[PDB]
Amino acid sequence: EASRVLRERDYRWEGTEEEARRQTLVGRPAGQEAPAFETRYFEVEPGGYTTLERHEHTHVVMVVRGHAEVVLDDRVEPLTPLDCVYIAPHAWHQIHATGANEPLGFLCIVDSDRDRPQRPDADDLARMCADPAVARRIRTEGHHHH
Amino acid sequence: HEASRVLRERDYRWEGTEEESGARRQTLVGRPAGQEAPAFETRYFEVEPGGYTTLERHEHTHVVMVVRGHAEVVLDDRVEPLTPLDCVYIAPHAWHQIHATGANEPLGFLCIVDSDRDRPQRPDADDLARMCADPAVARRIRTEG
Ligand SMILES: [K+]
Ligand SMILES: [K+]
Ligand SMILES: [Zn+2]
Ligand SMILES: [Zn+2]
């Protein structure tokens, strides 16, 4: 399984064929035990970011507000609404709010039954920072620019 | 059994939560393209103005987010207006049908479903008569034949 970025233009998502902070919208926390998935909205102030992490469970993200850059393993991808991102199992990921004034808002869909996030260590960081674009974008407490 | 929910949105806040003739389908993340890992599939549907989805019920749920145009959704005995970015939870076994309202702007919506899921069941005459007890539903629904 590889991660996919599906950019949208005029309600057509790239790579698809046309055939004829947190608000938990739907799922266990909101009173719905029936779906196999939980549906959340996240909002991040400009300059803000999610935690750089990996886990077995996948993500399906749709940007609905503002601008993002997503770290996907060895790639940094700019996003705007209504771009969709599939984050594959065990892919390192971090979403950054990159707009000037407009907060980033995105839908995030995950399995109802899912594992815990795992943080990168020194070797994880050193390996992933062999890419200059990734090194420049990622934020941990021991890693910022320079 | 669970209730269907409409969560209307204004300025990226959905009510009910706290801050802490058919459709053209694009499968954004799904099994055909090889995304077997998630427990769910994520699709975008587009319905031409005046169009409608198939009136049906099934055990599996829907989570819908309207992202384009105007909608009216039948949810059992209710007819509910929708605009982006309203979210709808369609509970197990609820009769549902989505209608594209508005002159020239197509209706576009995100639809998320379980990857492991049952087949849609159509209404017969008895189901239709039952749901047409509500005059709003009766005027809204569209069936073939
Ligand atoms: K876009
Ligand atoms: K709205
Ligand atoms: Zn994650
Ligand atoms: Zn359905």
Question: Could you say which ligand is closest to the alpha carbon of residue A9?
Answer: 1
What span, in angstroms and rounded, lies between the C-alpha atoms of A32 and A34? 6
What span, in angstroms and rounded, lies between the C-alpha atoms of B46 and B27? 11
Q: Which residue of B has its CA nearest to A13?
A: B28
Domain boundaries, chain A: 1-146
Set B111, B113, B131, B141: catalytic member = B111
Q: Is B87 on the interface with A (CB under 8 A)?
A: yes
- Resolution of this model in Å is 2.0
Question: Could you say which ligand is closest to the alpha carbon of residue B68?
Answer: 2
- Are B15 and B24 contacting, i.e. CB atoms less than 8 angstroms apart? no
H, E, C per residue of chain B? CCCCEEECEECCEECCCCCCCCEEEEEEECCCCCCCCCCEEEEEEEECCCCECCCEECCCCEEEEEEECEEEEEECCEEEEECCCCEEEECCCCCEEEEEECCCCCEEEEEEEECCCCCCECCCHHHHHHHCCCHHHHHHCCCCC
Structure tokens at A24: 């938990």
Q: Is A107 on the interface with B (CB under 8 A)?
A: yes
CA A34, distance to chain mean position in Å, is 25
For residue B84, list its beta bridge partners: none
User: How close B40 gets to chain A, by Cα (Å)?
Assistant: 6
For the domain covering A1-146, report its CATH number. Answer: 2.60.120.10
Q: Which residue of B has its CA nearest to A81?
A: B67
Q: Say whether A53 counts as a known binding-site residue.
A: yes
What span, in angstroms and rounded, lies between the C-alpha atoms of B118 and A106? 29
Q: Which of 3.40.710.10, 3.40.50.11930, 2.60.120.10, 3.10.20.30 would CATH assign to domain B1-145? A: 2.60.120.10
